[model samples]
Target: IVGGYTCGANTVPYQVSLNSGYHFCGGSLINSQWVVSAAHCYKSGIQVRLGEDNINVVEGNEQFISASKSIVHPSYNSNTLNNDIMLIKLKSAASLNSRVASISLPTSCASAGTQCLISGWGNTKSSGTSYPDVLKCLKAPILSDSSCKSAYPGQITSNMFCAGYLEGGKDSCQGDSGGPVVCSGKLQGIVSWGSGCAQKNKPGVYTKVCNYVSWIKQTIASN
Candidate 1:
């Protein structure tokens, strides 16, 4: 699987405890009481572990908090994978430790030609399908809107943005969803979906973090 940023508390690693087993992914802390992950990963009620390395945060870890409820983006659709972002509320608040701090959301999104970072537990190669036990991350530059649109012709939508190494190396992998796309330490987006992992010519799509700021604030504010 492709690897990106190293695992840590602030980096926010997540897992889904499904009947089949557990699937690991990356997430980012957005506040004292909330975490930002992909909407697709919030299926069938999952748990989010924070402030600890490894997939399971262990039963006694002081910084870990279980997922009380997951709020998937209202417009999310599995078919087209539109609006593929979501927020997870912790059962309790987390300490502002060295490894734990909410990633700052961008007041404004990066325009075309800017760069961003995509963090996850996916493979670095497109062919590698398995997710790694330890969290990994990588940096990918954002592509221009016109260029992004031209690459897919019609599949690129307003709710999505493109990021990856245009040179054909480095990308997000299968288990990396719900992770952050950070630029200058500011969250710009969330790893969403794409045709293939690390595909040539096809950039990875991300949830437009800027678009959901209002909805996110309103939702988080109420709690």
Candidate 2:
């Protein structure tokens, strides 16, 4: 997360590093065998590192599991970024333990003005090259859909939502895509895209998870 600070180890156990030979995106463990992330983050040779807090060091609690298959939302749009969500079926179910678990998916949409937590290994500086080795987190206020529309007129859709400060200086940035946006202890959104890292009036954009709960459930049950 850009302009965010280091988070305590295992503070967000559901958080995982989605890797394609390297850490490129963040993800949330929604079930013992399923991981959710942004469709745009998908690539070949994908794997998930669970119970991981740092990218450069190996921790005893960490478990790296290969992804058997990735199912991108059929409606996912690359150009406009609509329905930018995906699910990964792990080669094996994650072993539930103290440092590894799944987060609760929201049953309903997050209310406007809710405060949500976003975390990732994205760049700390907007123009920096070095992404953080340790996980970082920040508190972002959920902006009303209507209010967020002003930031990206004609681009924001019902499937997408926004969160962050209008004045900026805090947001999910590059490499943070597919991270969780937790609101009131529920998985509310997935870090999808944005105009820039922590730019003024350009809050981060996310794929509204609530809008796809049915799709997720059906996909999981059938796949």
lDDT score of residue 109 within candidate 1: 76
Per-prediction TM-score to the true structure, in the order listed: 0.85, 0.98
Q: Write the per-residue lDDT of candidate 2 for residues 52-93, one digit (tens) a residue.
A: 887889967899999999999998989998999999999999
Supply candidate 1's per-residue lDDT for 202. Answer: 74
Candidate 1 on 1-223: residue-level lDDT in tens?
A: 2535564533442222211146555677888778878777776545555544455445333364577777888888987778888777877887766656678877887887677666655656677455555556576788888877877788777888888855555678677777778888788888787767766787778888888888889999986
Give model 2 RMSD, 1 decimal: 0.8
The lDDT of each candidate is 0.69, 0.91
lDDT of 1: 0.69
lDDT for 82 (candidate 1): 80
Q: After superposition, how far is residue 99 of candidate 2 from its true place, in Å?
A: 0.9
**C-alpha lDDT of candidate 2 relative to the true structure:** 0.91
Q: How close to the true structure is residue 145 of candidate 1, measured as C-alpha lDDT?
A: 86
Worst 10 residues of 1 by lDDT: 12-21
